[PDB]
Enzyme design. Structure first.
Site, PDB file in Angstrom:
ATOM      1  N   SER A  45       0.943  -1.230   0.011  1.00  0.00           N
ATOM      2  CA  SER A  45       0.056   0.101  -0.060  1.00  0.00           C
ATOM      3  C   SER A  45       0.689   1.423   0.080  1.00  0.00           C
ATOM      4  CB  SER A  45      -0.975   0.144   1.295  1.00  0.00           C
ATOM      5  OG  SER A  45      -1.981  -0.746   0.970  1.00  0.00           O
ATOM      6  N   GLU A 143      -4.391  -7.526  -5.826  1.00  0.00           N
ATOM      7  CA  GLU A 143      -3.134  -8.236  -6.631  1.00  0.00           C
ATOM      8  C   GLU A 143      -2.008  -7.998  -6.408  1.00  0.00           C
ATOM      9  OE1 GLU A 143      -7.015  -8.953  -9.058  1.00  0.00           O
ATOM     10  OE2 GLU A 143      -6.266  -7.478  -7.784  1.00  0.00           O
TER      11      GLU A 143
END
EC number: 3.5.2.6
Length: 268
Positions: A45, A143
């Site tokens: 992230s 993913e």
């Protein structure tokens, strides 16, 4: 001016059971601490911070972009969308989505913004435009969090992350208002209290963006830190480990950040 003082990063990563990559720059003198700094690690992230910077860059040429209202359907709410789930029935502005992506790692917000920028290739293009030839985003969420050993998709290096973070928060890659907005979003992050921030005294300003992949001991944090009385420090700490089930460690990230500040001679 690199590694003028050795620090026990090797013992730290060995106790962790994986690999730790660190690059820290003292923007006053140009001195650096560097350990596995040119190896690739998964972004996880942490890409969302650079995503928000890319949105801000576009807003320099699109005056009304940040205030544009974005509506979305329930299909857009993927797991861990703590802010955007509260505005499903109303929509949010681009600026609000950007803040959520940075400060809460909000997945739906990040996906909507990625779409706005033209997907993984568009964010990669933005990073190329600031001189970062290492960063690559290849896949959408989630993913891109697979963290497969040896897979270069969705990776960068600690060095390139730090170099790009410096350009965007302290350098000229963004115009001054957008630069300060990027800094303010990073300062307001809520997800990194146990990572670089845990090594930073409470009386110093700091902003950061975390990443946590959820496999292969893979997690990270990058930050800009303003020690009082001296120039700011930019640093990145990335980890990975060989086995899918290996757990990441926030404590190892904080410990690596402490070693980086010690190596730079920053009293903390």
């Amino acid at each position: 001016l690199t590694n003028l003082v050795a620090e026990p990063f090797a013992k730290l990563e060995q106790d962790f059971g994986g690999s730790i990559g660190v690059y820290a720059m003292d923007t006053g003198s140009g001195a650096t601490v560097s350990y596995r700094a040119e190896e690739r690690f998964p972004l996880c992230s942490s890409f969302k911070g650079f995503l928000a910077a890319a949105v801000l860059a576009r807003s320099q040429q699109q005056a009304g972009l940040l205030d544009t209202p974005i509506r979305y359907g329930k299909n857009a709410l993927v797991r861990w969308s703590p802010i955007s789930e509260k505005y499903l029935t109303t929509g949010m502005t681009v600026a609000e989505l950007s803040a959520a992506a940075v400060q809460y790692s909000d997945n739906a917000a990040a996906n909507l913004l990625l779409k706005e920028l033209g997907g993984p290739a568009g964010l990669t293009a933005f990073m190329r435009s600031i001189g970062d030839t290492t960063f690559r985003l290849d896949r959408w969420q989630l993913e891109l969090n697979s963290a497969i050993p040896g897979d270069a998709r969705d990776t960068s290096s600690p060095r390139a992350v730090t170099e790009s973070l410096q350009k965007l928060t302290l350098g000229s890659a963004l115009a001054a208002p957008q630069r300060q907005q990027f800094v303010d979003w990073l300062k307001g992050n809520t997800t990194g209290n146990h990572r670089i921030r845990a090594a930073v005294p409470a009386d110093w300003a700091v902003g950061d963006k975390t990443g946590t992949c959820g496999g292969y001991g893979t997690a990270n944090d990058y930050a800009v830190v303003w020690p009082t009385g001296r120039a700011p420090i930019v640093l990145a700490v990335y980890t990975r480990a060989p086995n899918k089930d290996d757990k990441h460690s926030e404590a190892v990230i904080a410990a690596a950040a402490r070693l980086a500040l010690e190596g730079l001679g920053v009293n903390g």
